[PDB]
Design an enzyme around this catalytic site. Structure first.
Site, PDB file in Angstrom:
ATOM      1  N   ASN A  55       0.817  -1.235   0.000  1.00  0.00           N
ATOM      2  CA  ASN A  55       0.000   0.000   0.000  1.00  0.00           C
ATOM      3  C   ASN A  55       0.852   1.289   0.000  1.00  0.00           C
ATOM      4  OD1 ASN A  55      -1.617  -1.652   2.759  1.00  0.00           O
ATOM      5  ND2 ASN A  55      -2.229  -1.895   0.613  1.00  0.00           N
ATOM      6  N   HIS A  68       3.173   2.237   2.102  1.00  0.00           N
ATOM      7  CA  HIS A  68       3.454   2.743   3.447  1.00  0.00           C
ATOM      8  C   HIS A  68       4.777   2.129   3.934  1.00  0.00           C
ATOM      9  CE1 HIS A  68      -0.359   4.629   3.977  1.00  0.00           C
ATOM     10  NE2 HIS A  68      -0.987   3.534   3.556  1.00  0.00           N
ATOM     11  N   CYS A 104       6.208   7.664   9.145  1.00  0.00           N
ATOM     12  CA  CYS A 104       7.204   8.316   8.316  1.00  0.00           C
ATOM     13  C   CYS A 104       6.655   8.207   6.887  1.00  0.00           C
ATOM     14  CB  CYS A 104       8.575   7.649   8.423  1.00  0.00           C
ATOM     15  SG  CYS A 104       9.773   8.265   7.205  1.00  0.00           S
TER      16      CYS A 104
END
Ligand SMILES: Cc1nc(-c2cccc(N)c2)cs1
Ligand SMILES: Cc1nc(-c2cccc(N)c2)cs1
Lengths: 269, 268
Positions: free
Chosen positions: B190, B192, B227
């Site tokens: 995804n 991330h 982050c």
């Protein structure tokens, strides 16, 4: 995994993991490259050679000699989906005094169809001095009984991509990713940067829009010099071309010393 | 892998790979953490939940709700050697409206002895607004039939390490690693940053001499903020003591906190 019936090649099956896939829910080229290294390592263990990545004999260990990758060439037709089983077959062959070659064939386990292939050129080097040396007959003979005698090539074609000369990218680069540094996860057991990390660094300078609309088909990467654990790298890319092609350069951030050069070929999804 | 006989936990075996080991020829804590994630994902698949790492129901997907790791706590007694087979058993349990817990037990396949254990706290969050929300009864009930009813804890001890409050490291840090950035290999499907990358970033500020003479025994890591792919991180460490350390990960510019943690190391 296991050596095949004739004992001259090795096969192993892998189930693609959740953290091993990219945005397409299929295995990244770095996951593929790690699986090539894993099956290479298990082949070396099966026949009694060192398992540190340098596949040495006791004769080479006494002389502080190692095998080092000079080139990696990978062609993927279909990346395995997460949960799929991929079978990889690998073998080695001497190429005279120049060095040796390790080849791989990737297959879909369910269909038996070839989904990829790879080849790599290895040179012999002294671990400490870093000086290359042509293979001796006594070291060559130790390996010949573990390799096919008749030529067996993953890339048999006339003017195949795997053997093409790669030019040096000239500044200014069209794209760049600057200040890349290895972390402990990028090191191998001997505290050297893993060869697969350099593939990742090459790909960092490809624009995200290319990655999102294309799929990586071919990557050829030359290894010229090692990135030390405390070195910083700059990744440079320029389009050379439906298919998109790029020229790549990895150099040390300060003085611009070349560590790798390569080419990638991408096809529209 | 497979669900166990009672269907309330999941087990899977892994053979340690050549690229998965450190300088001791044994699995790194990041390889261990990736295997915990993998067995967590295969457990979710086996019972029909999403396989993206957020283990959602169709009710949660309609509401744009996800499960997010708030804390990871891992204790390793022996790291598996290259070529060894490790078996991991995992289960989940609701902790009221606060959130949920996933636990793991690692075992040596040949001896059957416990070589490690881990626990993690998860909270429910709206994936778009990033606002946390207490679990509703209707979502909780969907999960209760896949979890043990009586408490089953990987860390049973009253007031154990896994539940200790972690303080904020104050400047100046004793050690630091600055300008850490994720590459594509650090992202999940995804796009991330993978939770395991943050463990690696925490460990980057530990001096090499500690890593060379000690073994990591315990790591507790809080996850405060994500982050982004274009963010830059600074990893800070200070000795608090066996050797113990306090850790802080913050964004390179404004110093916004992304994680805090503690590590405990034993002399080899
Ligand atoms: C595991 C194996 N490695 C080899 C091998 C390794 C280096 C050089 C040559 N010529 C062969 C053959 S079987
Ligand atoms: C794959 C599985 N996930 C769970 C699970 C996931 C979220 C919350 C709770 N309470 C349980 C149980 S089995």
């Amino acid at each position: 995994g296991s050596l095949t019936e004739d004992g001259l090649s090795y096969k192993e099956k892998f189930v693609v993991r959740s953290y091993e896939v990219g945005s397409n829910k299929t295995a990244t080229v770095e996951t593929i490259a790690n699986l090539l290294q894993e099956v290479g390592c298990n082949h070396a263990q099966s026949v009694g050679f060192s398992t540190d990545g340098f596949a040495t004999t006791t004769t080479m260990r006494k002389l502080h000699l190692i095998w080092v990758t000079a080139r990696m060439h990978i062609e993927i037709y279909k990346y395995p989906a997460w949960g799929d089983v991929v079978e990889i077959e690998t073998w080695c062959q001497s190429e005279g005094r120049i060095g040796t070659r390790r080849d791989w064939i990737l297959k879909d386990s369910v269909t038996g169809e070839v989904t990829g292939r790879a080849t790599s050129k290895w040179v012999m080097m002294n671990q400490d001095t870093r000086r290359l040396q042509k293979v001796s007959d006594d070291v060559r003979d130790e390996y010949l009984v573990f390799c096919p005698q008749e030529p067996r090539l993953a890339f048999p074609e006339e003017n195949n991509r795997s053997l093409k000369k790669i030019p040096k990218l000239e500044d200014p680069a069209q794209y760049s990713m600057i200040g890349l540094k290895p972390r402990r996860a990028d090191l191998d057991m001997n505290q050297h940067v893993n060869n697969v990390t350099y593939i990742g660094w090459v790909l960092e300078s490809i624009p995200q829009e290319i990655v999102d609309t294309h799929e990586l088909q071919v990557i050829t990467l030359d290894y010229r010099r090692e990135c030390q654990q405390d070195d910083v790298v700059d990744s440079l890319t320029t389009t050379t071309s439906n298919d998109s092609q790029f020229l790549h350069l990895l150099r040390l951030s300060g003085d611009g010393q070349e560590i790798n050069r390569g080419t990638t070929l991408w096809r529209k999804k």
